[PDB]
């Protein structure tokens, strides 16, 4: 309700400054005192003539600093972040003359890289910072949560550069300012009701396995209360997005046909990202990205000379040649009426396997003669690690006796 002239904002930002670490020091950790960056502006603040009323904090440089360092130092920085902010608030609570000076926090932001970019490691790092300022604004007096940048979990809200997306858009600041200004005037704190994507968390682990077939399957652990996930598969080198969607199961498969569309052949490298998706509201949380080389057992030897023979009685015997010193072969059997139903999948310790006609009639529901066409796959197996080498496939009919 006040006049627009009666409100006067000022700029006190310092380039890449941090209360604990940064190019410009805002607070001193050796002894509790303002840093050189903060000491360079305290003179003009006192000479302004009006005591400060609201202090706005947007994004400490510690979030960018923790991107490179190991995760073991992350809890250490959080302790220093809390101590410095509490000490800084008490210093200017009395020096600047405002007995009810308040600090308002703005939600932390992540970093992207490229066109249709996957979220960088800052997504896993800013969450700790994000899950740090919330309790400072709801379990403590003196610190408040101002607002969040709209579309923070979305890459489009930043869009400031073609690669290494860091800064925001022109409309992002205006969108943030109107929400931030409303909280200041109405004294409403955002820490009471964090947004939906705040509760969503990135998956703990993300890795890919190449099966006996040249396809690659992505695996990540499930979370209680989560039923959907959103994935994003992109080109390894050019970075162009390949496929994306919503997954109701915490697994994804990269078939051979898709690989032969993006490239001229199947590849071992992969750049994959996935995040938990809330189907009730459509909110998207932090995304975990996996790049490099998928898990594989290419150091092993593939089986060779796969032949299938049907005997006079009716049973089918499968034979192959391989490495006797590594006599461990995982065998997968598939039906012919549908090419996806598994007959059996077991570890084998011989170069030959017999499929008795008794169970052939059992699986297909037949009464006599067994199966004539059988889908068979054998691959050298490693009991120590569980890795599966590229196996040789013999499919369908067996040779007549």
């Amino acid at each position: 309700g006040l006049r627009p002239i009666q409100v006067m904002p000022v700029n006190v930002a310092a380039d890449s400054a941090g209360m604990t670490v940064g190019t410009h020091k805002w607070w001193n950790t050796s002894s509790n005192s303002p840093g050189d960056a903060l000491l360079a502006i305290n003179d003009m603040v006192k000479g302004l003539g009006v005591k400060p009323d609201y202090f706005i904090e947007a994004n400490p440089w510690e979030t960018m600093y923790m991107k490179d360092v190991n995760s073991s130092t992350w809890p250490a920085l959080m302790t220093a972040f809390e101590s410095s902010n509490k000490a800084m608030l008490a210093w200017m609570r009395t020096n600047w003359g405002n007995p009810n000076l308040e600090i308002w926090f703005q939600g932390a932001t992540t970093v992207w890289f490229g066109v249709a970019p996957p979220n960088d490691l800052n997504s896993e790092a800013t969450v700790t910072v994000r899950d740090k300022q919330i309790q400072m604004a709801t379990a403590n007096i003196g610190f408040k949560l101002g607002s969040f940048v709209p579309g923070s979990n979305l890459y489009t809200a930043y869009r400031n550069v073609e690669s290494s997306w860091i800064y925001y858009t022109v409309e992002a600041f205006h969108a943030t300012a109107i929400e931030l200004g409303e909280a200041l005037a109405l004294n409403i704190n955002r820490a009471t009701n964090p947004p939906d994507w705040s509760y969503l968390r990135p998956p703990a682990n993300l890795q890919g396995r190449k099966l006996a077939t040249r396809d690659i399957k992505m695996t990540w652990d499930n979370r209680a209360g989560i039923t959907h996930w959103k994935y994003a598969n992109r080109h390894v080198t050019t970075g162009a997005e390949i496929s994306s969607g919503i997954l109701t199961s915490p697994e994804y498969v990269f078939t051979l046909n898709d690989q032969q569309n993006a490239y001229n052949g199947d590849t071992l490298n992969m750049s994959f990202s996935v995040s938990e998706y809330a189907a009730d509201s459509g909110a998207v949380g932090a995304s975990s990205s996996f790049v490099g080389v998928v898990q594989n057992g290419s150091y092993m030897q593939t089986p060779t000379q796969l032949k299938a023979a049907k005997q006079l009685n009716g049973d089918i015997i499968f034979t192959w040649v391989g490495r006797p010193s590594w006599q461990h072969f995982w065998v997968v059997n598939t039906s012919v009426n549908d090419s996806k139903t598994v007959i059996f999948s077991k570890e084998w310790s011989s170069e030959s396997l017999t499929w008795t006609v008794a169970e052939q009639n059992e699986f297909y529901g037949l009464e006599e003669g067994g199966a004539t066409h059988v889908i068979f796959m054998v691959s050298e197996y490693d009991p120590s690690n569980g890795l599966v080498s590229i196996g040789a496939q013999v499919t369908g009919q067996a040779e007549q006796p």
């Binding site: 046909n257 032969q260 569309n261 001229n264 052949g265």
Partner: protein, 99 residues
């Protein structure tokens, strides 16, 4: 309206500059419709050169198959061996998304 015509004049200049030059006024490489059109010519030029080679090779391989059917026992060239054909077969499946 005069101010708007400034931008159109600049853009029409770039279309003219697309000819006799591969870079715009600012220096970036042209990539629009004219840029895509040039790439099609490059593929077609290679296609014409490649098409002349395959038909020329038809005569040489024709003179060999007629020998094999009448002089059975002649050893086929190493380029026609079982191992040599496998690389071609694997490429075709991968190129056409057959596998």
């Amino acid at each position: 309206l005069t101010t708007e015509q400034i931008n159109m004049t600049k853009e029409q200049k770039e279309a003219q500059r697309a000819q006799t030059s591969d870079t715009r006024t600012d220096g970036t490489r042209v990539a629009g419709s004219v840029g895509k059109q040039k790439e099609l010519y490059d593929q077609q030029i290679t296609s014409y050169k490649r098409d002349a080679e395959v038909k020329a090779a038809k005569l040489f391989t024709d003179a060999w198959v007629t020998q094999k059917t009448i002089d059975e026992g002649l050893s086929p060239p190493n380029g026609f061996t079982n191992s040599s054909l496998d690389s071609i077969l694997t490429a075709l499946k991968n190129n056409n998304a057959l596998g």
